[PDB]
């Protein structure tokens, strides 16, 4: 048949979710580099890189395997270059560094880029597993979003703050059982790894080497190496949520090592999700779940597989919806509390600044409900924007790209004038938002994105030369064309003075 949820595994999804909340509430109501490296993996192990990485390898080939070198070229850069600067100066948080190297105005111009990047990303951490819960249950797609949003805004009652190791080992601990449920049963349903790796070659899904040296193609070897490094350096080098847990480590050699331990963990989640993408093709190289036996979104290709493969095993398809949901309760509550304490630290200095602690403790939970509405409101926007991995790396590239340019202009260039960086940032943020929205309004043609076949069978003038030659830029180049503008513009204005 097809297989769906039963009454017995529904509690398995709810029971594994509440115990993760039970670990968090006990240590709240109560760094030696091995915990914080696993806590650095749990931020990577979101519902974007579990639900959407197989559905993207299944459609656009396994060129995504070249990211295993991209994950190596970012942890080399983010440990040699960006790590000894934020550590040896005794920095508390990486946006306080910007008023040390430049004036205080660019820090308020810096964290406003962080807020628009965060609320655009945390709408994709929320909407993606709600796009999975709508598939397995048919609940509703717009109601499961506001279901997920209100349980994290009420988790801002000092439960989401003070992140513990024990609520982060459970994220991987379910996810090491979530993939091993779906990898192992897919091999025995298809008869060997050498059968999964045989129909994928006949479908053209291998696709490991492209080497085409033009930026207009979406996935090359050069886009993933050059442009993909500049995207992920904006996450592991300058993003405040992933530098706060580098300074908090005690020894400088250990904090460097924590960035080198999760490189194994990033290589694990990439290999265990690319191989789910090749498993997802060999199961459906006759009747895809698109075009027939439909799933609304492309990101409903992993939860459609799980109820198709684990239908005769009760208990286990609730575990796959659990590990998609397990990442969000740690991410979004920390995502909101990162937006909470930074905003009230930003707000008090142009305010009256002499209010009492009763209003300040009120406004810490005053804006936390406001941002959760902006978390929900941007999650309704994320029903657009497409593939939800292409959109999760664009809003890292098109917004957080030029933000990485300031730290490149500050650290490397010794003569960065502060009036040069402020007009350098807003020039770079304008070029990236020009190409970043131009691609998401007019998508690239399929001769540049190269999507693969889907095989519906065996189931028993418009273009203008700006829209074609620059809006078809690769989505991993929205930070290269952002950083290499605010480094060029940021120097020549500084060179003018």
């Amino acid at each position, epitope marked *: 048949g097809i297989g769906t949820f039963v009454v017995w595994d529904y509690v398995v999804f709810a029971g594994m979710l509440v115990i993760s909340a039970a670990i968090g509430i006990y240590y709240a109501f109560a760094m030696t580099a091995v915990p914080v490296a696993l806590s650095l993996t749990a931020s990577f192990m979101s519902a974007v890189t579990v639900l959407g990485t197989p559905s993207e390898v299944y459609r656009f080939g396994a060129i995504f395997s070249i990211f295993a070198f991209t994950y190596f070229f970012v942890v080399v850069i983010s440990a040699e270059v960006f790590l000894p600067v934020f550590y040896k100066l005794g920095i508390t948080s990486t946006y306080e560094y910007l008023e040390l190297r430049f004036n205080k105005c660019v820090r308020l111009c810096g964290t406003v880029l962080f807020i628009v990047q965060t609320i655009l990303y945390t709408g994709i951490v929320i909407y993606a597993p709600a796009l999975a819960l709508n598939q397995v249950t048919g609940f509703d797609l717009w109601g499961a979003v506001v279901a997920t949003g209100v349980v994290c805004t009420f988790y801002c009652t000092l439960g989401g703050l003070k992140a513990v190791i024990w609520t982060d080992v459970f994220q991987v601990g379910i996810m090491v059982a979530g993939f091993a449920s779906v990898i192992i049963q897919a091999v025995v349903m298809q008869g060997g790894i050498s059968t999964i790796l045989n129909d994928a*070659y*006949d*479908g053209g*899904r*291998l696709n490991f080497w492209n080497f085409n040296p033009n930026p207009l193609q979406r996935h090359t070897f050069w886009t993933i190496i050059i442009g993909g490094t500049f995207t992920w350096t904006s996450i592991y080098g300058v993003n405040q949520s992933q530098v706060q847990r580098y300074i908090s480590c005690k020894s400088r050699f250990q904090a460097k090592l924590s960035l080198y331990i999760n490189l194994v963990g990033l290589w694990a989640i990439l290999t265990c999700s690319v191989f789910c993408g090749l498993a997802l093709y060999s199961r459906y190289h006759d009747c895809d779940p698109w075009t027939a036996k439909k799933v609304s979104a492309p990101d409903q290709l992993m939860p459609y597989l799980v109820l198709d493969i684990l239908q005769d095993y009760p208990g286990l398809p609730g575990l796959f919806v659990a590990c998609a949901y397990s990442g969000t309760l740690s991410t979004v509550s920390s995502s909101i509390n990162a937006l909470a304490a930074v905003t009230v630290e930003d707000l008090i200095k142009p305010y009256f600044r002499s209010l009492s602690e009763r209003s300040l403790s009120w406004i810490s939970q005053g804006m936390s409900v406001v941002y959760g509405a902006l978390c929900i409101g941007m999650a309704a926007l994320a029903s657009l924007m497409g593939a939800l991995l292409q959109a999760a790396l664009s809003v890292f590239g098109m917004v957080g790209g030029p933000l990485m340019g300031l730290f490149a202009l500050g650290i490397l260039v010794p003569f960065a004038n502060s009036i040069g960086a402020l007009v350098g940032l807003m020039a770079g943020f304008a070029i990236s938002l020009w190409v970043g929205i131009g691609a998401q309004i007019y998508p690239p043609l399929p001769e540049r994105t190269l999507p*693969l*076949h*889907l*095989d519906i069978q*065996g189931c028993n003038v418009q273009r203008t030369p700006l829209m074609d030659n620059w809006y078809s830029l690769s989505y991993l180049y929205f930070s290269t064309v952002g950083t290499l503008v605010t480094l060029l513009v940021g120097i020549l204005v500084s060179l003018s003075t």
Partner: nanobody
Amino acid sequence: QVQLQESGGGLVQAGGSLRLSCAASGNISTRAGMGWYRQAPGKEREFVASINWGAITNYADSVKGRFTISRDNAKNTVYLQMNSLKPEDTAVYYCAVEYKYGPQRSDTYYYWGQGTQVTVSS
């Protein structure tokens, strides 16, 4: 990406026979639905002769019966074969492979190969 090539075409007698071959290198999907388009001088991209993985063979109304086409899935190639060559059906011929990548109707792209000119005499 697929970088496909072709051969088998040139000057023949008007009324004879010919077999046009077309290989397909790269990481081309086998269950693809390769086809055969042509372009007359000064005209538009002309008919499709599509053959899918299930060998459901299609023709245009001008070329029913007189032309035939068959593929084999072992080497990913297609053979377009000619009979009853008219004095005016001469054109350049392209070897397309119609990918389908989505649920809608207007989402297909073609991977056009290089041309091959076939001419007649009388």
